[PDB]
Amino acid sequence: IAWNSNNLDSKVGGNYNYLYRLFRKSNLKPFERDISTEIYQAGSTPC
Amino acid sequence: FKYFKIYSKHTPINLVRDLPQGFSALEPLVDLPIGINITRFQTL
C-alpha cells in the first residue's frame, strides 16, 4: 500500500530526516532490519 | 528453539540421574517474532 506524502516530509529547504544505505558488504535476509552504520571498506587499506 | 516457536512438553521423570527411558512428543507454546538473527545462547 503506497501513497505520496509531500504535505509533510519535503521541507521548504529540503528534508533531512530520512536516510538510506548506499552499498553494503553483506546482503539482507528476507524480513531483516539493517541498523548498523560503519565506514564501509570499498577497497583494501581498512578505513 | 526454532518468529520464535517454543515447543514444550512436561515429563514426569522419577529417578536419580542419567536419562531414563520413556518418551513423548513436543508441543509448541508461544511465538514472539524477534525479527533479527540469533548467533548464540546461554543459561544463567
Swiss-Prot record, chain B:
Result of changing D18G: In strain: Beta/B.1.351
Positions of glycan attachment: N37
Functional summary from the UniProt entry: Attaches the virion to the cell membrane by interacting with host receptor, initiating the infection. The major receptor is host ACE2. When S2/S2' has been cleaved, binding to the receptor triggers direct fusion at the cell membrane. When S2/S2' has not been cleaved, binding to the receptor results in internalization of the virus by endocytosis using host TFRC and GRM2 and leading to fusion of the virion membrane with the host endosomal membrane. Alternatively, may use NRP1/NRP2 and integrin as entry receptors.
Origin superkingdom: Viruses
Protein name according to UniProt: Spike protein S1
Outcome following mutation: I13V: In strain: Omicron/BA.2.75
Full-protein interval shown: 194 to 241 of 1273
Assembly and binders: Binds to host ACE2. RBD also interacts with the N-linked glycan on 'Asn-90' of ACE2. Cleavage of S generates a polybasic C-terminal sequence on S1 that binds to host Neuropilin-1 (NRP1) and Neuropilin-2 (NRP2) receptors. Interacts with host integrin alpha-5/beta-1 (ITGA5:ITGB1) and with ACE2 in complex with integrin alpha-5/beta-1 (ITGA5:ITGB1). May interact via cytoplasmic c-terminus with M protein. May interact (via N-terminus) with host bilirubin and biliverdin, thereby preventing antibody binding to the SARS-CoV-2 spike NTD via an allosteric mechanism.
